[PDB]
Amino acid sequence: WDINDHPYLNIKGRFQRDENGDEVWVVSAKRMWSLTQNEWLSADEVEIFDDPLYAGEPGFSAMIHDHEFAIHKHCTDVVVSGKARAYAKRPVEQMECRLLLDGHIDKTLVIHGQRDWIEHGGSITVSNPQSFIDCDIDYSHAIGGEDERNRIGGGVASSNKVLLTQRVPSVFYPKEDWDATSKKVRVAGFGPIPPFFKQRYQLAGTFDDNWLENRRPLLPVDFDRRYYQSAPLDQQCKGYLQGGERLMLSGFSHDDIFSFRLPREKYRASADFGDDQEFKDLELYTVFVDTEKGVVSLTYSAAFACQEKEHLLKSTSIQAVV
């Protein structure tokens, strides 16, 4: 059952550099389940992503998905790409979207209809929401703007003039809405956290003059491997998912809730660096729910440190654990 060329997993490996500049062989294995077709897609139809994908300019637009070769994650990320879709296609002015993963995640966000700014003697507020059937809910609709928490959002500006060129944010946690005091309103969404969000790039450490002169080429001393997690913090699981957990999403389909139960198969990888055979358990690093396509992607990963014997890598095989 030791399969280099696996019959249902798509498997890909990339070398990465760790925070000391040392090479790491990262093996990622991926499965996709069609919620519509109720079947696993064949490995040929499964793509493991070498690079992040952005909606617009990289670094200035919502991140659709991150790359899949993190050297380490301490828990499973769960991320959603989809739209708010009102029940039965009845127009509404606001609705709730909920991500439920038993034991790990229970998250509701409130989605508002589109709104306009209302100016009044140098004071600005928001109009009533417009009715909608479906809408986008990515971080360009979250609080942000002139704000390192989310520089692609709206509602945070240094002047009324700038504020009026921004989109009124529409995605919030329950009991929160836009207020002029921006830091009291959380950035909200279900999608992956772009590295240019302060909550993430802060974890990469301080690239200051001290670093430039005395630490480089190493990463900064305050680099934190949590930087590799791409889910929102309340969508990071309690450790790694083990199989059998139930996932439920409501508000992303007009007609029904999405429901998915994780497979129980677990995997072990083996990498051959010459005469040295190495074994590491894969863990589930990412659960990516695309409700527009009706697919759930599952990416498993393991990382083999190989600064000693880079060129000596012969083979990598993955076998299911019985």
Residue numbers in the entry: 4 to 325
List passages from the publication reporting this PDB structure:
Prior to secretion, many T6SS effector proteins require chaperones and/or accessory proteins for proper loading onto the structural components of the T6SS apparatus. Based on these findings, we propose a model whereby DUF2169 proteins function as molecular chaperones that maintain VgrG–PIPY spike complexes in a secretion-competent state prior to their export by the T6SS apparatus.
To circumvent this obstacle, we next screened a panel of DUF2169 proteins encoded by other Vibrio spp. that are closely related to V. parahaemolyticus and found that the DUF2169 protein from Vibrio xiamenensis, which shares 64% pairwise sequence identity with DUF2169 from V. parahaemolyticus, readily crystallized and we were able to solve its X-ray crystal structure to a resolution of 1.85 Å. The resulting electron density was of excellent quality, and we were able to model the majority of the 337 amino acid protein except for its three N-terminal and 12 C-terminal residues. The overall structure of V. xiamenensis DUF2169 reveals that its secondary structure is almost entirely comprised of β-strands arranged in three antiparallel β-sheets that form the core of the protein. These three β-sheets fold into two β-sandwiches that arise from the two shorter β-sheets stacking against the same face of the third, more elongated β-sheet. A search for structurally similar proteins in the Protein Data Bank using the DALI webserver indicates that the structure of DUF2169 is unique and therefore is considered a novel protein fold. Our structure also reveals that in its crystalline form, DUF2169 adopts a domain-swapped homodimeric arrangement with the swapped region (residues 195–232) consisting of a protruding loop that contains a short α-helix contributed by each protomer. In particular, Phe210 and Trp214 from one protomer π-stack with the equivalent residues from the other protomer. Collectively, these biophysical data support the conclusion that the domain-swapped dimer observed in our crystal structure is an artifact of crystal packing and that the protruding loop that facilitates this artifactual dimerization is highly dynamic and extends away from the core of the protein when it exists in its monomeric state in solution.
